[PDB]
Amino acid sequence: ELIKEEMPMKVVLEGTVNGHQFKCTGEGEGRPYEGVQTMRIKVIEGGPLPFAFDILATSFSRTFVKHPKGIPDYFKQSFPEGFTWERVMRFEDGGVVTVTQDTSLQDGVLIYNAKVRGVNFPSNGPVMQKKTKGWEPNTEMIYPADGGLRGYTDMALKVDGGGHLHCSFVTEYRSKKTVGNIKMPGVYAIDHRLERIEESDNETYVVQREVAVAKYSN
Amino acid sequence: GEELIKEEMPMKVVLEGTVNGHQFKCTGEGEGRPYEGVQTMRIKVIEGGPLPFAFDILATSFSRTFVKHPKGIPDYFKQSFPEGFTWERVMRFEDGGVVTVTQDTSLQDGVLIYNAKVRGVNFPSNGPVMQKKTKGWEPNTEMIYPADGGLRGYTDMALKVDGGGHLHCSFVTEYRSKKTVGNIKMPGVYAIDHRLERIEESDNETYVVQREVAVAKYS
Secondary structure, three states: OOOOOOEEEEEEEEEEEOOEEEEEEEEEEEEOOOOEEEEEEEEEEOOOOOOOOHHHHOOOOOOOOEOOOOOOOHHHHOOOOOEEEEEEEEEOOOOEEEEEEEEEEEOOEEEEEEEEEEEOOOOOOOOOOOOEEEEOOEEEEEEEEOOEEEEEEEEEEEEOOOOEEEEEEEEEEEEOOOOOOOOOOOOEEEEEEEEEEEEEOOOOEEEEEEEEEEEEOO | OOOOOOOOEEEEEEEEEEEOOEEEEEEEEEEEEOOOOEEEEEEEEEEOOOOOOOOHHHHOOOOOOOOEOOOOOOOOOHHHOOOOEEEEEEEEEOOOOEEEEEEEEEEEOOEEEEEEEEEEEOOOOOOOOOOOOEEEEOOEEEEEEEEOOEEEEEEEEEEEEOOOOEEEEEEEEEEEEOOOOOOOOOOOOEEEEEEEEEEEEEOOOOEEEEEEEEEEEEO
16 A cells, blocks of 8 residues: 555665675655566766676666566565565576665655675686576566565576576565565466666666566466 | 385485585485485585584485385385485575585495585574584475476474574475486375484584484375
8 A cells, every 4th residue: 555556666786796896776666556667777876897797687667567467566565664685596507696685664665785705607608707687587486484475586698699598596585574464465477577768887887677477476 | 116126225316516606425324214214324424514504404315215205105215116206495594504415315236325515604603503503404394286297395494503503495396307308206294203313423513323203194
């Protein structure tokens, strides 16, 4: 109900990848009930990144998922308190990313605060060499748990040449709402497509749009 | 498949890896009762011992063939023979430690052959694991979901710490049959109660004996 038909965001993401420190800010808007959102991102410190921005792209938004009538919306129900998500991204080439994020709501604005630690990226890998060309459309599996959701996607990062780099994404979503009932969903699936709209100054500025739609699985 | 899994089976295991850049190799021999859900492993750290970390984070990577399945729950694991199955796991500790695991289970001349590669990273130097202040895992429940011909396993584990605390760890496991031709009867959602217990250790944990009880039930 505090999640309006049109909602704006402000995001701050910081971390280390291999040893390289950076800080990013974003502002954006979208239609949480239609499942669309756009983000304007700046690398404000440590830019240009000596690695593909694609490994950060997925860490800038699950409030903006179109849920059919019959699938309860864990994300939208989490307000005003919001929810946290924790992710491990396991790259086939040996790279690992750990992500901690806080989603909150302040004065009608969604506030995202993400911390990121990447380690063991092959210095010769496509990521550290910036030879990546975006993520494939994909589907995330959602499994309920004691006061939370578990998220699984086998993701494919496109490489120069037309190869893919395999990466398992696995996420813990947890409401910060501890009192009052959330209606829990069963298992379902979220088709998500993230597309880069625009980049400049060696990827220190990026515009991206995500379209996400929930569906019945089993 | 289920015919090749006898009421007693032995196993042999190689486990190799790196934790926070420290390299090691472990071998194991053991045996168990797959339909009763009991198994025992005698493990040796044969290279890079004593480990500058708690064996407990490796313990859990040394066996789902040995899970007591009631008649009504199809046993994905026993059905996967003689090809056997692979499992892939992420263990995230609340204190930042992360372990990535790849394992190959195969059957050779009536012996189960385990091969595991382990990659630990971001264990805090001052944390209970790197400080070897752990006292084994709590009994816990794994949720099993079917996923496109494989299974996904989710446990929220608790590693006991010196002084009565716990270090909390999420486990995600992708299990995948190497049986590509032939049909496997897929289970629905179910649960596995699993208790891993250290029986015996010596020589600064370069020799460890552990037993696991694992029993499937409806969810």
